[PDB]
Amino acid sequence: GGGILDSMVEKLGKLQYSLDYDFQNNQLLVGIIQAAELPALDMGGTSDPYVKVFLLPDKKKKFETKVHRKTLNPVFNEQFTFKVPYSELGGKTLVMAVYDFDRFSKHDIIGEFKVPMNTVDFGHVTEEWRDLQSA
Ligand code: NA
Numbered sequence: 001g002g003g004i005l006d007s008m009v010e011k012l013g014k015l016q017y018s019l020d021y022d023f024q025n026n027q028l029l030v031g032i033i034q035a036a037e038l039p040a041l042d043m044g045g046t047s048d049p050y051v052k053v054f055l056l057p058d059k060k061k062k063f064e065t066k067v068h069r070k071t072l073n074p075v076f077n078e079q080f081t082f083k084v085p086y087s088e089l090g091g092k093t094l095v096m097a098v099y100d101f102d103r104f105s106k107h108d109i110i111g112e113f114k115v116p117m118n119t120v121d122f123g124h125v126t127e128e129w130r131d132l133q134s135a
């Protein structure tokens with residue numbers, strides 16, 4: 001069953017987020033809440049996680065949480081706002097990507113996932129845990 005095991009979702013941790021569309025101010029609100037069970041490094045190391053948060057296909061610069069040093073279970077508790085009228089949302093996709101900050105080399109991705117806005121349930125707050133997907 002090795003081929004089948006290789007196809008399984010790898011244990012790269014999970015991110016909890018929330019989402020709500022503010023119809024008063026016409027903006028998408030995103031909560032980056034916390035991550036859990038991020039993978040250990042070699043030599044028993046922990047990573048320095050942060051999250052990038054952004055819409056596709058939009059080309060504007062990505063939002064980022066603070067970096068949380070030396071933790072596999074960070075609590076971010078950050079909010080981000082996207083000023084996009086509802087009518088223009090559905091064709092877009094929200095991306096959340098967790099990276100390992102390093103000062104001296106490329107920041108390795110830990111993993112990512114995507115939320116197409118056309119299967120967002122508008123008008124109720126969305127909150128879930130999502131397994132980070134390999135990249
Ligand atoms: Na696997």
Ligand code: NA
Nearest residue numbers: 005006007010
């Ligand atoms: Na694998």
Ligand code: NA
Nearest residue numbers: 005006007010
């Ligand atoms: Na493999």
Ligand code: NA
Nearest residue numbers: 010132133134
């Ligand atoms: Na994975």
Ligand code: NA
Nearest residue numbers: 010011012131
């Ligand atoms: Na997983």
Ligand code: NA
Nearest residue numbers: 012013131132
């Ligand atoms: Na995972």
Ligand code: NA
Nearest residue numbers: 034035036073
């Ligand atoms: Na956590």
